[PDB]
Scaffold this active site. Structure first.
Site, PDB file in Angstrom:
ATOM      1  N   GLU A 423       0.872  -1.177   0.000  1.00 32.66           N
ATOM      2  CA  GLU A 423       0.000   0.000   0.000  1.00 32.66           C
ATOM      3  C   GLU A 423       0.916   1.238   0.000  1.00 32.66           C
ATOM      4  O   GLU A 423       0.821   2.081   0.880  1.00 32.66           O
ATOM      5  CB  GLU A 423      -1.012  -0.016   1.183  1.00 32.66           C
ATOM      6  CG  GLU A 423      -0.411  -0.217   2.570  1.00 32.66           C
ATOM      7  CD  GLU A 423      -1.355  -0.236   3.764  1.00 32.66           C
ATOM      8  OE1 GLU A 423      -2.482   0.299   3.664  1.00 32.66           O
ATOM      9  OE2 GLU A 423      -0.925  -0.708   4.837  1.00 32.66           O
ATOM     10  N   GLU A 432       4.654   8.822  -3.537  1.00 31.33           N
ATOM     11  CA  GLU A 432       5.323   8.319  -2.340  1.00 31.33           C
ATOM     12  C   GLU A 432       6.399   7.374  -2.705  1.00 31.33           C
ATOM     13  O   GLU A 432       7.088   6.891  -1.817  1.00 31.33           O
ATOM     14  CB  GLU A 432       4.360   7.761  -1.302  1.00 31.33           C
ATOM     15  CG  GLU A 432       3.459   8.869  -0.778  1.00 31.33           C
ATOM     16  CD  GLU A 432       2.427   8.481   0.250  1.00 31.33           C
ATOM     17  OE1 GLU A 432       2.470   7.331   0.721  1.00 31.33           O
ATOM     18  OE2 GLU A 432       1.583   9.332   0.601  1.00 31.33           O
TER      19      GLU A 432
HETATM   20  N1  LIG Z   1      -0.871   8.367   1.303  1.00 26.21           N
HETATM   21  C1  LIG Z   1      -0.992   7.225   1.988  1.00 26.21           C
HETATM   22  N2  LIG Z   1       0.081   6.386   1.978  1.00 26.21           N
HETATM   23  C2  LIG Z   1       0.035   5.245   2.742  1.00 26.21           C
HETATM   24  C3  LIG Z   1       1.190   4.433   2.810  1.00 26.21           C
HETATM   25  C4  LIG Z   1       1.170   3.293   3.587  1.00 26.21           C
HETATM   26  O1  LIG Z   1       2.221   2.409   3.721  1.00 26.21           O
HETATM   27  C5  LIG Z   1       3.593   2.884   3.666  1.00 26.21           C
HETATM   28  C6  LIG Z   1       3.760   4.214   4.392  1.00 26.21           C
HETATM   29  C7  LIG Z   1       4.292   3.851   5.785  1.00 26.21           C
HETATM   30  C8  LIG Z   1       5.142   2.589   5.629  1.00 26.21           C
HETATM   31  O2  LIG Z   1       4.956   1.816   6.820  1.00 26.21           O
HETATM   32  C9  LIG Z   1       4.495   1.907   4.423  1.00 26.21           C
HETATM   33  O3  LIG Z   1       5.577   1.421   3.608  1.00 26.21           O
HETATM   34  C10 LIG Z   1       6.811   1.594   4.293  1.00 26.21           C
HETATM   35  N3  LIG Z   1       7.859   1.754   3.286  1.00 26.21           N
HETATM   36  C11 LIG Z   1       7.935   2.808   2.382  1.00 26.21           C
HETATM   37  C12 LIG Z   1       9.013   2.661   1.580  1.00 26.21           C
HETATM   38  C13 LIG Z   1       9.669   1.452   1.984  1.00 26.21           C
HETATM   39  C14 LIG Z   1      10.768   0.679   1.546  1.00 26.21           C
HETATM   40  N4  LIG Z   1      11.551   1.053   0.529  1.00 26.21           N
HETATM   41  N5  LIG Z   1      11.040  -0.490   2.171  1.00 26.21           N
HETATM   42  C15 LIG Z   1      10.240  -0.879   3.169  1.00 26.21           C
HETATM   43  N6  LIG Z   1       9.175  -0.249   3.671  1.00 26.21           N
HETATM   44  C16 LIG Z   1       8.900   0.894   3.019  1.00 26.21           C
HETATM   45  C17 LIG Z   1       6.609   2.802   5.213  1.00 26.21           C
HETATM   46  O4  LIG Z   1       7.521   2.849   6.303  1.00 26.21           O
HETATM   47  C18 LIG Z   1       0.018   2.896   4.265  1.00 26.21           C
HETATM   48  C19 LIG Z   1      -1.132   3.617   4.136  1.00 26.21           C
HETATM   49  C20 LIG Z   1      -1.139   4.843   3.427  1.00 26.21           C
HETATM   50  C21 LIG Z   1      -2.248   5.701   3.379  1.00 26.21           C
HETATM   51  C22 LIG Z   1      -2.182   6.862   2.676  1.00 26.21           C
HETATM   52 BR1  LIG Z   1      -3.670   8.039   2.703  1.00 26.21          BR
END
Ligand SMILES: Nc1nc2cc(O[C@H]3CC[C@@]4(O)[C@@H]3O[C@@H](n3ccc5c(N)ncnc53)[C@@H]4O)ccc2cc1Br
Ligand SMILES: [Cl-]
Ligand SMILES: [Cl-]
Ligand SMILES: [Cl-]
Lengths: 625, 310
Positions: A423, A432
């Protein structure tokens, strides 16, 4: 409910008058601060030396009453743009005098008319009052939908009313306002008090006021129809416009004498409260996005920053989003492992950016519903969220879930995945950095593996909103480019705006990406047909995603996933507003650029006129890799 | 002072009207201070005005008085700030001024009133941009006209025709009205649209000619039947508030202004008399029905001046 005021041009005794309007149910009073007929002289003797007092005493009301219940009104003889010089000069001095008395009294708002085309000197005197002492006070420009000249009874034998269609001429009062607020340099203290007549104009004229700072709507008693019982009511068309104005949360002002004399001034007000209470209630999305209407927010950068606990918590407050993810995994497991293999084929599922685990639980609910066997790897780079994951795996999930505290681009996975689930999408889909993240992870996806989401597409639509343009303008911060606010996107619950053309697709990404030379950079030209006269202030962005097959998520208004409130739209502003005429095409250019270190967008309008290229080299805005 | 009569008269004098018998009618407004209202006064001795204790009758109105007019010999028609057109009637003894009707039909200040030739109908102009025709007996509006595009400054009923009246506005129009026509107004004026018209006076002897004052002190002579302006003179240095003709066979034209002066002009618009008696805006002018060379003026300085015109 409805916040309403009584407009009066006759207040014999201020205390009794205020009490009467209060009794009737009004929240505030619009009234003269000097006697409307009391023309004052500032230059010529003897009238200049007229003995005082020049008006009523401030002592007649408490400070609280002046601050909250009284909206002052400019005297009708004050004509700063008169063709008679003596009048121009006396009106300038009278205008400052009255505006200064209102400021002295601490009035919350002060009405001025826009009743002719030329208000240049009215604007100069107002602008000069705003730059004399820093105050919070509002100026409400009383402007009609229909100019009185275009409303007059066709009773002049030798001057007939025009019976021909005049598309731009019928929009003339919007230009009176536009020019006035352009001259005043988009002061945040200058709003519209839109006066509605007995006959509504063509819809295009009503639509011209879309995205404008409307603070009040003026309803003359004379526009109210009489129902069979004799109560004041409104036409279905007037009712339609009241519902638009209720969504804008304008203050309703009742002007004119009682023409439904068998009743009281509270009956005009009672009808509005009736219309207010009887309007459709707020849905799930409408209740969620309550205090967020036109509130600009920085888009999240979850790759560069570790999101807080309460951010994952609101992320998790979206049943539709996760129901859809469940259904997408459920459909995929069934297509990947037939019923005769339902105990010999355990599918290796990878949640890439697992946060606090909502896609890990959704994968588990999918496997139980599909009656299939799964192995889960929960990958999370944010060590703080990983604390939730590891306490979940110990307390509930068990050995089925392998929590990995790593960046997905750097993780050396022990085995390949059948399905990678994530997600990583923002309001503009790829903003993102979901492409880059999944590209560095797809090496550990099986040669026949599935990505959920499998595809995503961003959309852009041109918008008009002087409210949001002024909001962006106010985002100037010290120690950076004075114009950097306009060279960055904002996540905002776009409310007071006008969509100038249907959204068109911008950038699309597919996962897995089978390209031999993978390039996430992009260049897209969009041509938007505009069928109104307007002002372009920016581009609204949205997205659509295919999770699996027909299972989708969307924030594009025409295909919006019902009841899903995770993402608000993005807004790409432009430094200078652009005039757009009916029949003209808005041409925009958007680029998705990158480095080894950062990703960004650049954009430019190339028709009807050109803009500067926004955010060149990511100078104002970058997304960290 | 008589019964019901207010102890004190409001500083801003709005109207001075001599009745056929010689009794002076006074319109007053409180345009400053705590209370913003008005009053109606009768002076059987014009030399005793503005003195409150030496009056025949007096009453207090709810709001200020923008315009006044004698309806016959006992009636008083009032243009109120309240949006009301009020008709007050003089007492059997003429010792009280009692309210006949108070009708709130105008949506803003009523600025101008005129009684139609017969004395059975009246016309009012307002800041609400409308012109209303009133049936004084039935206390109702027969016709409401939105011909103008800005506030109605003046309305003047023709001397001897119950269907005809003049109107002027901040929309730069001078309208000739004949309620007999399906489209009652007709735009009249000079070859060039100059300064806004602020005052009108029908000629008492030539029923096809009138005078109009503008916002820049100019007085103009207009033949309706020739619909082109003949004579004009810069009489005042500020807006012409009023134009009132002397009762004489060959009338004299009294001109009022915000310049705080009175001018009396001949047939060729030449200046005969000039009075700088006032120290504030001159609001009204009435020639005595008794001594024809005696002209009375009221201003905001609270002076009831009695001029002797040569
Ligand atoms: N605009 C929004 N973006 C959302 C994004 C989300 O999930 C993402 C954001 C938070 C999060 O826990 C996770 O992916 C992780 N993330 C990122 C990049 C990344 C990498 N390269 N490796 C591992 N982990 C990695 C990071 O830490 C979850 C819900 C969202 C809701 C909305 Br509204
Ligand atoms: Cl302008
Ligand atoms: Cl921000
Ligand atoms: Cl829209």
């Amino acid at each position: 409910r409805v916040s309403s005021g009584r407009d009066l041009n006759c207040v014999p005794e201020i205390a009794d008058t205020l009490g009467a309007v209060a009794k009737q149910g009004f929240d505030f009073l619009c009234m003269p601060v000097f006697h409307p007929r009391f023309k004052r002289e500032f230059i010529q003797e003897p009238a200049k030396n007229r003995p005082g007092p020049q008006t009523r005493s401030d002592l007649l009301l408490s400070g609280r009453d002046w601050n909250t219940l009284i909206v002052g009104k400019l005297s009708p003889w004050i004509r700063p743009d008169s063709k008679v010089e003596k009048i121009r000069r006396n009106s300038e001095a009278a205008m400052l005098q009255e505006l200064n008395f209102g400021a002295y009294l601490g009035l919350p708002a002060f009405l001025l008319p826009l009743n002719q085309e030329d208000n240049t000197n009215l604007a100069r005197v107002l602008t000069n009052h705003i730059h004399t002492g820093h105050h919070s006070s509002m100026f409400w420009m009383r402007v009609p939908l229909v100019a009185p000249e275009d409303l007059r009874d066709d009773i002049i034998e030798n001057a007939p009313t025009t019976h021909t269609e005049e598309y731009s001429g019928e929009e003339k009062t919007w230009m009176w306002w536009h020019n006035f607020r352009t001259l005043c340099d988009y002061s945040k203290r200058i709003a519209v008090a839109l006066e509605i007549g007995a006959d509504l104009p063509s819809n295009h004229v009503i639509d011209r006021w879309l995205g404008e700072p409307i603070k009040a709507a003026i309803l003359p008693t004379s526009i109210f129809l009489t129902n069979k019982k004799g109560f004041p009511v409104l036409s279905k068309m007037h009712q339609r416009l009241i519902f638009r104005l209720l969504k804008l949360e304008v203050q309703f002002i009742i002007t004119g004498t009682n023409h439904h004399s068998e009743k009281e001034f509270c009956s005009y007000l009672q009808y509005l409260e009736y219309l207010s209470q009887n309007r459709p209630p707020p849905n799930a999305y409408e209740l969620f996005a309550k205090g967020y209407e036109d509130y600009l927010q920085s888009p999240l950068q979850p790759l560069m920053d570790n999101l807080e606990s309460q951010t994952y918590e609101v992320f998790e407050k979206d049943p539709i989003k996760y129901s859809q993810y469940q259904q997408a995994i459920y459909k995929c497991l069934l297509d990947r492992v037939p019923e005769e293999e339902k105990d010999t084929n355990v599918q290796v599922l990878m949640v890439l950016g697992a946060g606090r685990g909502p896609l890990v639980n959704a994968s588990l609910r999918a496997a139980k519903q599909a009656d299939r066997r799964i192995k889960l790897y929960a990958v999370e780079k944010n060590p703080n969220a990983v604390v939730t994951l590891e306490n979940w795996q110990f307390e509930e999930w068990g050995s089925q879930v392998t929590v990995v505290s790593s960046d997905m681009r750097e993780w050396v996975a022990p085995e390949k995945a059948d399905i990678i689930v994530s997600e990583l999408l923002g309001s503009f889909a790829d903003n993102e950095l979901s492409p880059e993240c999944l590209d560095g992870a797809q090496h550990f996806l099986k040669d026949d593996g599935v990505s959920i989401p499998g595809e995503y597409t961003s959309f852009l639509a041109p918008i008009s909103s002087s409210k949001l343009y002024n909001e962006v303008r106010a985002c100037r911060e010290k120690d950076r480019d004075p114009e950097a606010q306009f060279e960055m996107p904002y996540v905002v619950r776009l409310h007071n705006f006008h969509q100038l053309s249907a959204p068109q697709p911008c950038f699309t990404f597919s996962h897995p990406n089978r390209d031999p030379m993978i390039d996430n950079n992009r260049y897209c030209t969009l041509e938007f047909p505009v069928e109104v006269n307007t002002v372009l202030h920016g581009f609204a962005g949205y997205f659509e995603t295919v999770l699996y097959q027909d299972i989708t998520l969307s924030i594009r208004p025409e295909t919006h996933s019902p009841g899903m409130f995770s993402w608000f739209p993005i807004l790409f502003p432009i430094k200078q507003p652009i005039t757009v005429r009916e029949g003209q095409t808005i041409c925009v250019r958007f680029w998705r650029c990158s480095n080894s270190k950062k990703v960004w967008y650049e954009w430019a309008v190339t028709a009807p006129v050109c803009s500067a290229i926004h955010n060149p080299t990511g100078r104002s805005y970058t997304i960290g890799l | 002072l008589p019964p019901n009569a207010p102890a004190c008269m409001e500083r801003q004098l709005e109207a001075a009207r001599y009745r056929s018998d010689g009794a002076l009618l006074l319109g007053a407004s409180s345009l400053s201070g705590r209370c913003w209202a008005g009053s109606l006064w009768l002076f059987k001795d014009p030399c005793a005005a503005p003195n409150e204790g030496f009056c025949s009758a007096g009453v207090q109105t709810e709001a200020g008085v923008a315009d006044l007019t004698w309806v016959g010999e006992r009636g008083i028609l009032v243009a109120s700030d309240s949006g009301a057109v009020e008709l007050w009637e003089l007492d059997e003894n003429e010792t009280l001024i009692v309210s006949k009707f108070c009708k709130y039909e105008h949506d803003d200040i009523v600025s101008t009133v005129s009684v139609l030739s017969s004395g059975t109908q009246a016309v009012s102009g307002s800041k609400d941009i409308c012109i209303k025709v009133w049936d004084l007996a039935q206390q109702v509006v027969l016709s409401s006209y939105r011909a103008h595009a800005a506030q109605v400054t003046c309305v003047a009923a023709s001397p001897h025709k119950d269907s005809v009246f003049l109107s002027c506005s901040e929309d730069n129009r001078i309208l000739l009205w004949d309620t007999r026509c399906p489209k009652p107004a007709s735009q009249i004026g000079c070859s060039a649209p100059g300064y806004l018209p602020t005052s009108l006076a029908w000629h008492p002897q030539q029923s096809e000619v009138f005078v109009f004052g503008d916002e820049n002190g100019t007085v103009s002579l207009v033949d309706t039947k020739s619909t082109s302006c003949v004579l004009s003179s810069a009489v005042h240095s500020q807006c012409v508030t009023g134009l009132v003709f002397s009762p004489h066979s060959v009338p004299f034209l009294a001109s009022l202004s915000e310049d705080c002066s009175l001018a009396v002009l001949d047939s060729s618009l030449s200046e005969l008399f000039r009075s700088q008696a006032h120290r504030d805006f001159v609001r009204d002018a009435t020639w005595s029905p008794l001594n024809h060379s005696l002209l009375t003026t009221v201003g905001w300085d609270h002076q009831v001046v009695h001029h002797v015109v040569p």
